[PDB]
Structures are given as structure tokens and as C-alpha cells.
Design a protein around this ligand. Structure first.
Ligand SMILES: *Cc1c(COP(=O)(O)O)cnc(C)c1O
Ligand SMILES: *Cc1c(COP(=O)(O)O)cnc(C)c1O
Ligand SMILES: Cc1ccc(CCC(=O)O)cc1
Lengths: 388, 394
């Protein structure tokens, strides 16, 4: 029987790491000056305390622990957290949240379509394909200005209708790094309510753009305007606990009734997929979040990280500027997040890795965190020499 | 849109605890628990497990993305734990999963990919959760006789007769050991016969191995599974570390795809990694790392096997006592099956009416199908349960 298994397609980003003075600028993970992905001080302190307070490992909650559910809700929505109309579901990372979100939506509407940004995280499309959900794209990245073709985005979105779902990146757009402003978000919200399309927000990098609260701004705008919203958050990057697999699905509803429905459906989704969600990572998160001392050190460390990266974008931009006398590469400093699409053609991308030895995703996606003071000029030299 | 959501039934477990907790009875007993509880009513963290966690806290330097299919050390240690020396790596595909339930879900998904017209045969009865997952997927589910309500043992003739109806490509789900909920198990000779039936029909066996170590012992509990692996070329094994490692909440499981050849193993391994990827990208690391650490570290593995063995023996002594108490009271050996059953669960064969009389008259709670948790018994509760069973005319 198993011999009938057709060969499946692998993941592009992960494939790179396998195919790796080498310079890694692929996989979206934060790395420090010494090319290491550290464990955050507070996270280490949390685990340490956990190892001393936990007396049992029995089965816990099917939708995650109340402490995790409450902390995550507050972290994301701040004061916009209306417990009476919000359903929470602890998941296996942000990807697990996205999948669960799609499963929930399809249950509610068997004939749902999904609008995704051109471009967007590859893994978004693969999952939808696997599920057999019709995917449509809305213009987003402006290839010339490397910014956002907001004009086109609004036009395409206006074509959405009731029952359809729109996937938005709350901040730090993967893979472009091009992001919407609060003014743009308000306009998107008016489009959404006019069309009746359910928004699904992918919140994977809250804290890597402009700050914890500022990065949640757009999400909070949509949440205060649209009566029904879905938010799939990840604690992988902002808490540095990638391998723990922890995230959560937030279902914002209009009334308590619908809320109890969704909460029930969500708990059922977990039960039918793997019974209980993993406890360890979720415990670290709630511990950090509910312990003043721990939250403070986490906020500080995350701040240091996001600040360092911003310095790197400006440094690289400058290097390139001086290497061409032209600030064409200025968009680099304007982008926000961990990535930036350079705009180099596929042929150039491959040429750079084969001769220069710097590995970046096929669509010219570079992980800014991968650079450093001594590798920056080298990268700049490479892009300059290759530029057709 | 979400208003359309059809209300989903709760876990039921909650309702059970709701009844019990509401009961104002001083001496109320709960044999409906589904986890192991020691003498003091606690589900402790095993010594080796707490040791592994201490060791991990000191040696871990990063938490970046690890393996999509799981870690090599974990996959190997689990394969050796379940298949022993009989582990043929060249044809064995492994997938770290979110607990045993995730392993089952993935096994069913993989099988459906290989054969769309898949039909699954489940025992009568089986872990309710099995059917739930299948109904959810929309897979054809067929039942095969198993529990003999009159003797409390295996209705083997019925099992064989029904299994004979399996076609090539169908999936037959077998509990490797410690049958949940019944407690009635197959002997190695019955496993041998089952293997023959499986060869004849060409049905793919899916083995649910969640209690290795709670029956007669670690190696002993894997006996039936190892026989199947030797006779049949394609075998799917869904393993759980929740109970025998006591890491229920960490969600640690394993899916082993035994294939007829290396080429087929590559396909299975790729399709499994793909399946993990399309569900949640990467599997949970913490619990798996605890497992591989306990297993690869001599000193730890030793203490673990020692602790598991003590638990196993403790439950066996519990069964003996109960069977004895019941023998003295009944003046017969009808309840002898209590000592023959293995695992932490045992279905007594009491009807829902009798189950209700037991709760109302004696304050003893158990699952509606008369399934009890042996671990919940003790020197003080045993005399009570015995008295109850007999007084209700079971
Ligand atoms: C990181 C990320 C996720 C989630 O990753 P998990 O490891 O599953 O937490 C989801 N979407 C995007 C765009 C991401 O970058
Ligand atoms: C416990 C159990 C499982 C799976 O447990 P997980 O908690 O998902 O690891 C599977 N089958 C049976 C019969 C079980 O008792
Ligand atoms: C499957 C997967 C791929 C990548 C990532 C990290 C985010 C990225 O590199 O785009 C997570 C999961």
C-alpha cells in the first residue's frame, strides 16, 4: 500500500539550510553577533523555576491553560481584550494556529476562498493547497519601489465577498519586510466591513518591527472595527522558543453565544488532531508574562534585539549607498522586521550563492539578523558586483 | 460567519468530574480516572524524568528549529524500545508526533494518501477517541468482535470470523497491549493466528502501542507487536510516551512506518515529514528530548525501568487483592478475570443500570461502560468495590 505514496515537494526555506566563509541569510530565526540563536534570559529563568514548582505532568486543558490564554490575549489586544466574546486555543506553534484557523473557517463556511498577499509566506499556500481551499492573491509588494502597492491591494480586496477570508500579516511582512501604516490599516478595515470578508491575521513577529505595542496596533485597529476576527499568534520568535512549538488561535466574536460555539469547535479541533496541545512552551510564556520581574527583562532583551537589527539595516543601507553613490537601496532601511526582498533576479540569486557563497532565499529574501559589521561590506560587494 | 458553527459536544470527562465533585459524600470513590495515580492519589513525575529535565536545563544552549520529523536520537531510541534488535532501520520510517493521538491521526492520514478507498476495522469496543478521529476524517469504519461480555475475555472466534472480511488495502487497528477499555488481551499464540489472517487478507495492521510497560513488562508487552513486524512487510505503529514515561502533558508520541523496501521507506519518510509540516511544521521538542535522554543514559534508563516495574507490580498486586476479596465474598471464581486482565483498565461487565446503582448506593464512580482504573484502588477502597459489585448483582 505505502508504495503508492507520491513524492511530495519540500520546503524552499528549509531546503536552503540543508544546502548549507559561508554566510547564512535564509531561515527566519534571530541570530546574535556570534552567529548564535540564544535562549532569552527570562525564558531560562522561567524553565528553572518551572522545574522546581511543577509536581505533576498529568493531562491539562484541551484548549491550553487559562493563564496562557489570558496572557496571550492581553499581549496581543491590550485593553481591547473582551473576554466575553473571545475564544482562545493553545496550538502547536503559529503554523498549528494557522491550520486550526483554516479548519475552523471551513467548518463555518464550506465554500470559503482565501485571499493572500502577493507575495506571502510559502507555507501559507502549501497548507491551503493541502486542504484544497481556493487561493486568490491581492497585490501587495511594489517590485519597483520595494514598498507596498497599496493602490492595487485595495482594488483587489474590494473584490472579496461575504464568507471569503483575507490573510494579513499583523506586522513584519514575511518575505518582503514592506509594511502597512496605521492610516493604511484603517482603510483596509473599511474595505473589510464593506465586503463582509473575515480577516485572518498572522502575528508571528510582534516585537521585531517598531515595538511590542506598536506592532500590535494594526491588529487592534481591525479588532475594534470588525466584529469577527481570527488571529494566529506565534511565540516562536519573540520568545525565542522555536522548538517548543507554542502559539495560540484567537477567535474574536460578536456575542457570547457565538463565542461558546467557536470555543467548543476549537477544542474539538485539537481533540481530533492530537488530543492536548504541548504544555512546556506555553508555560514558559505565561510565567514570563505574569511575573513582573520576568516580563520586564524579556521586554528589555527583545528591545535590544529589535534595536540591534535596525542598526544593521541602516549600516547595510549605508554600505551600499557608498558603493554606488546612489541610494537605490534605501528601501532596506525603510523595511521593518527580519527580512527584506532585495529584488535581485533568480539568476542573480543563484550566482551570488554559487560564487560569493552567501545563501539567501530564491526570491532574494535576506535575514537581516544574519548580517554583522564584518559580513555587511562583503554582502554589499556581492550584490554590487552581481547587479545586472 | 462563525455563527454557523454546529455546536460540538464536550469531552465528557468534565461532566464525570462535575458529578463526582458535586457529590457531598464523605467516602466517594473515583475509578473513572484515566491516568495513573499513586497511593496518595497523585500522578508524580518519574525520577528519571525530573533528572533528564535538570540535565537539559544545564546543557541546552539554543532553542532554534530542530528536526521536522523529530530528532535522530529520539527516533532511534523509540524504535529500539519498541522493536528491539529486530529494528531494520533501512526500511523503518519514523515520525516524532504530538503524543500518541497525533501518531494515530498521522497514520490514518498517511494511509489515506496511499489508498483513498481505505476502510478501518476497530475492535468492539475500542478507545472511543479512535472512532471520533475517523468519523471526523470521514473514513469508513467497521467493527470486529473482541470483548466477551459473559467471560470478560477475548471472543477470539468472533474476532477471526469478522477480520476474515478485511480486504487488501483495509486497515486493521490492534492495541499492542493493555487493551483500553477492556483489559482483556491476546496471547502470543492468538497474535500468531492474527498475523496469518493479516497475511491472507493483505490488510495493513495499525498498532496502537500506548501502554508498553504496564502489562507484563517492557519486552513482554512488545511481544505481539514484534511478531506482527516479523510476519507482515508493511506495519504502522502509533506509540505513546505519555503513560509509561508519565509525561502526559508534554505530548510525546511516535509513528513508525515499517516498509517492504528502502525505496518505499523514503517515500513514507518524505510523506510523513510533509504531514507534520502541513499540520504544525515542527513537532514538540521538550518531551521527546526527555525520553531520548532517559533512554540513552544508562543510569537514567535503569532508574526508569525500575520505577515503571514497581508501578506495574503494584497494580498487579492490586488486581490480585480485588480478585481475592471478590472470591471470598462471592464463594466463586466468576470475577477471576480481574487478575487475568492486564493494564490499568478493566471493564467489569456491569450494565449502565448497575453502574448507576453502584454510584447511587455506594458513591463509587466509574465510566458508564463499567470501566475501572485499577490504580484508583487501595487497601481501603477494595473491600468497598467488592461489596458493591456483589450487592448490585453483577
Ligand atoms: C514564524 C512564522 C510562523 C509560525 O512559525 P511557528 O514556528 O509555527 O511558530 C507563521 N507565519 C509566519 C509568516 C512566520 O514567519
Ligand atoms: C493514552 C492512549 C493513547 C494516546 O495518548 P496520547 O496522550 O495522545 O499520547 C492512545 N491510545 C490509547 C488506547 C490510549 O490509552
Ligand atoms: C516550515 C517553516 C519554515 C520556516 C519557518 C521560519 C520562518 C521563515 O523562515 O519564513 C518556520 C517554519
Amino acid at each position: 500500500m505505502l508504495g503508492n505514496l507520491k513524492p511530495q515537494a519540500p520546503d524552499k526555506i528549509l531546503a536552503l539550510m540543508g544546502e548549507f566563509g559561508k554566510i547564512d541569510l535564509g531561515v527566519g530565526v534571530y541570530k546574535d553577533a556570534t552567529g548564535h540563536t540564544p535562549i532569552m534570559r527570562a525564558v531560562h529563568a522561567a524553565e528553572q523555576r518551572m522545574l522546581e514548582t511543577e509536581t505533576t505532568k498529568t493531562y491539562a486543558g484541551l484548549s491550553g491553560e487559562p493563564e496562557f490564554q489570558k496572557a496571550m490575549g492581553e499581549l496581543i489586544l491590550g485593553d481591547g481584550l473582551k473576554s466575553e466574546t473571545t475564544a482562545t486555543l493553545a496550538t502547536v506553534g503559529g503554523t498549528g494556529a494557522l491550520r486550526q484557523a483554516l479548519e475552523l473557517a471551513r467548518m463555518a463556511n464550506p465554500d470559503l476562498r482565501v485571499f493572500v498577499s502577493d507575495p506571502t509566506w510559502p507555507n501559507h499556500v502549501s497548507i491551503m493547497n493541502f486542504m484544497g481551499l481556493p487561493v486568490q492573491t491581492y497585490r501587495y509588494f511594489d517590485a519597483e519601489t520595494r514598498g507596498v502597492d497599496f493602490e492595487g491591494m485595495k482594488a483587489d480586496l474590494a473584490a472579496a465577498k461575504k464568507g471569503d477570508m483575507v490573510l494579513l500579516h499583523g506586522c513584519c511582512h514575511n518575505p518582503t519586510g514592506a509594511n502597512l501604516t496605521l492610516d493604511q490599516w484603517a482603510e483596509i478595515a473599511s474595505i473589510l466591513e464593506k465586503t463582509g470578508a473575515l480577516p485572518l491575521i498572522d502575528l508571528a513577529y510582534q516585537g521585531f518591527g517598531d515595538g511590542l505595542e506598536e506592532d500590535a496596533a494594526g491588529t487592534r485597529l481591525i479588532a475594534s472595527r470588525i466584529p469577527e476576527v481570527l488571529i494566529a499568534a506565534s511565540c516562536s520568535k519573540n520568545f525565542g522558543i522555536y522548538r517548543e512549538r507554542t502559539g495560540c488561535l484567537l477567535a474574536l466574536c460578536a456575542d457570547a453565544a457565538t463565542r461558546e460555539l467557536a470555543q467548543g469547535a476549537m477544542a474539538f479541533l485539537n481533540r481530533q488532531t492530537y488530543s492536548f496541545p504541548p504544555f512546556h512552551g506555553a508555560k514558559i510564556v505565561s510565567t514570563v508574562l505574569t511575573t513582573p520581574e520576568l516580563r520586564a527583562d524579556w521586554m528589555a532583551e527583545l528591545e535590544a534585539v529589535r534595536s540591534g537589527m535596525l542598526r544593521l539595516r541602516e549600516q547595510l543601507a549605508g554600505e551600499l549607498r557608498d558603493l554606488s553613490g546612489s541610494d537605490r537601496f534605501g528601501f532596506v532601511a525603510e523595511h521593518r522586521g527580519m527580512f527584506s526582498r532585495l529584488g535581485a533576479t533568480p539568476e542573480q540569486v543563484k550566482r551570488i550563492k554559487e560564487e560569493f557563497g552567501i545563501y539567501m532565499v530564491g526570491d532574494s529574501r535576506i535575514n537581516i539578523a544574519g548580517l554583522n559589521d564584518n559580513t555587511i561590506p562583503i554582502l554589499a560587494r556581492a550584490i554590487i558586483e552581481v547587479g545586472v
